[PDB]
Structures are given as C-alpha cells and as structure tokens.
Design a protein around this ligand. Sequence first.
Ligand SMILES: Nc1nc2c(ncn2[C@@H]2O[C@H](COP(=O)(O)OP(=O)(O)NP(=O)(O)O)[C@@H](O)[C@H]2O)c(=O)[nH]1
Ligand SMILES: Nc1nc2c(ncn2[C@@H]2O[C@H](COP(=O)(O)OP(=O)(O)NP(=O)(O)O)[C@@H](O)[C@H]2O)c(=O)[nH]1
Ligand SMILES: [Mg+2]
Ligand SMILES: [Mg+2]
Lengths: 166, 166
Amino acid sequence: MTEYKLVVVGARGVGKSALTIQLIQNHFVDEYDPTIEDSYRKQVVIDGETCLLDILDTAGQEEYSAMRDQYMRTGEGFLCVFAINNTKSFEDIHQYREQIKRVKDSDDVPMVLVGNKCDLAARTVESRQAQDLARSYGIPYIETSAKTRQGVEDAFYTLVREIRQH
Amino acid sequence: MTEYKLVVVGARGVGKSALTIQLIQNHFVDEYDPTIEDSYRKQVVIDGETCLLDILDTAGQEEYSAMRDQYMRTGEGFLCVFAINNTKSFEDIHQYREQIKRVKDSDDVPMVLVGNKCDLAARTVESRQAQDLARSYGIPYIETSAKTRQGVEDAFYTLVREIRQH
Ligand SMILES: Nc1nc2c(ncn2[C@@H]2O[C@H](COP(=O)(O)OP(=O)(O)NP(=O)(O)O)[C@@H](O)[C@H]2O)c(=O)[nH]1
Ligand SMILES: Nc1nc2c(ncn2[C@@H]2O[C@H](COP(=O)(O)OP(=O)(O)NP(=O)(O)O)[C@@H](O)[C@H]2O)c(=O)[nH]1
Ligand SMILES: [Mg+2]
Ligand SMILES: [Mg+2]
C-alpha cells in the first residue's frame, strides 16, 4: 500500500507532539516532554484509500542544524507549525520553509501552515497574517488545537491530499 | 465580512441536500424531497476568519438547462457531487465541470470532487477512479457521508480554502 512519509517541524513548545499523539492515540498530552525524535506508523483509510501514515515528530530547535537535512530529504510532505500566542515561532517559519526548499532542490514541496493552540484566548499572531503568509508560499493555512482536537485530522489529511496532487 | 458564494451541484439523488443540511442544521435527512432551489446563509469561523457561508443547493437535473448558467456565473466555488454506488452520476460529473468552465470563461475555477454515500457497502465507483479523475482536473477529491457526517466539514472547508487561494 501507498505510504506517505510526513514530517512535523517547527519551533519548540508549539505542540508538534501534541498534534501527532492526538491523531495517533486520540488524547491530549498536557506534559512537558521535549522531543529528540519520535516516529509513528499508523495504517489508516483516507478518501477511500488504504494508506500508511509514517510520521516523524522532530525537535523544535537544538544541535539539529544541517542535521535536519537528513529528514527533510526523505519526508514527502511537511507540517509547519507555529503557535498562535508565540510571535517568535511564527517568524521562525520562514527559516524552515527555506531550508526545506534548499535540501529538496525545489520551490514547490507539499506543505501546510498550521497555527496551533487556537483554543487560547490571548493570541499574538492574527490569522490575516498567517493567511497572507500561507498565500505567498502557494500553501494552505489551517488552525488547530491539540487540546480540543479542533482541526487536527483536517491538517494531516489536507497535507496527504497535497502529496497526492504533486 | 468576507462571504463565500458556493454552489452544490451534481446529479439527482446523490445527496447534495443531505450534505448541506448536515452542515447547516446538523442532522440527517433521510427523506425523499427533490430540490428546485434552496439557498442557505450561515455565519461561521474558518481558520480563525469570520465569514458567511452563502450556499446554493441545486436541482440534480431537469429544465435547468442553459438555465444553470445563471448560478454558475455567480458562485465562486463548486462542490461536484456524485454518489459512490451510482456510476451514471460519476460519469455525469464531466458534463457539469465543462458547463462551469464554459460560463466562467476559465480553466481553473475553485472546485472539489465529492464522493458521497461512503457509508454504503456495495459501491460501483472505486476511489482510484475518482482520485485519478480529480487528479486530471487539478482538483481535490474527498469522500463523504451525510448519514455519518463523515467528511462533510472537510469538503466544505477545503473548497473555501480553494477560493481563498485563487
Ligand atoms: N493550550 C494548549 N496547549 C497546547 C496545545 N498543544 C500543545 N500544548 C502544550 O504546549 C506544551 C508543549 O507541547 P509539545 O506538544 O511538547 O510541543 P513540541 O512542539 O513538540 N516541543 P519540542 O520542540 O521540544 O519538541 C505542552 O505543555 C502542551 O500540552 C494546544 O492545542 N493548546
Ligand atoms: N445511505 C446514504 N443515503 C444518503 C446519503 N446522503 C443522502 N442520502 C439519501 O439519498 C436520497 C436523496 O438525497 P438528497 O439529499 O435529497 O439528494 P439530492 O442530491 O439533493 N437530490 P435532488 O437532485 O433531486 O435535489 C435520500 O433518501 C437521502 O437520505 C448518505 O450519505 N448515505
Ligand atoms: Mg515534541
Ligand atoms: Mg436536493
């Protein structure tokens, strides 16, 4: 069966891991637990197609430097996550989209911008902003909450449909 | 606020109206009730954006002939629905995509192919088929069930994100 290699990337603390365990295991991890690397394989059905989700959950920042090049070379689609109450992580999005284009040797790579933690009142990143950014890349923008589970299947399934269309 | 004019089109009996009332009013209409024209406005929030859903539910076939030209001129995005146990309605999809391109004077109009009634065992339209078709148009394919509500928010929200990107 068709597998889709996907990698979840973005800055630390934005909820990369909370989105992935809400999808795989259906529950909210409200813990403090920084990732080095976690990989997850889940056999799923999407738009009637049998497929395997081979997800790679990554570390926000650290001595993952050019050392990101390796997963970025092999992931077919990317979730670029920032958090809606963290302006720095939204500004850091640029840096990841450029390194991904730099290793994949292309200007169109399957991607979706994910504005996580949409359940929190007190956001510092408005959606106009994050929509126009998504618009400038020709990339989808979707808001999520790993707490409510609002938007999480939609962000992962949209990205599969982006790999499917490339 | 931003409104999105959307029109739901396709052959009779495929569940155009069942998808729309499952979205607007949250419940399954298992009745027999052919549509002439129904319009629905629902103020919603999508990816943090406040917007109004102005949906037009149409008649499958009938003396809506060139008489479709009128709604097709004004809808910004289209849901092209067939039913997964009805081969004729899937084959009829071609006919609507061509009349829509003919009145909008373009080759790219926001659209998503919707394979409804995915809850029924005994399908005559496989998803490979419906995926490759969607692939040939540069259009998304999504499966739904207005009975289970499986896929219905996803099909309508994807299409808004298609108007947003045009
Ligand atoms: N309120 C709220 N908190 C969330 C949400 N998603 C994640 N969090 C919280 O944010 C914190 C960090 O989450 P985690 O999922 O570990 O983030 P990460 O992006 O994987 N961090 P790291 O880069 O180190 O791997 C946790 O306390 C977690 O519960 C959300 O949707 N809303
Ligand atoms: N099992 C099943 N039946 C469904 C589903 N969606 C619609 N139906 C059924 O299909 C029949 C016709 O549905 P309706 O929504 O009226 O279809 P329409 O496409 O709007 N017909 P018309 O072109 O005349 O307007 C009804 O008996 C309805 O409940 C679905 O998801 N699964
Ligand atoms: Mg983590
Ligand atoms: Mg109807």
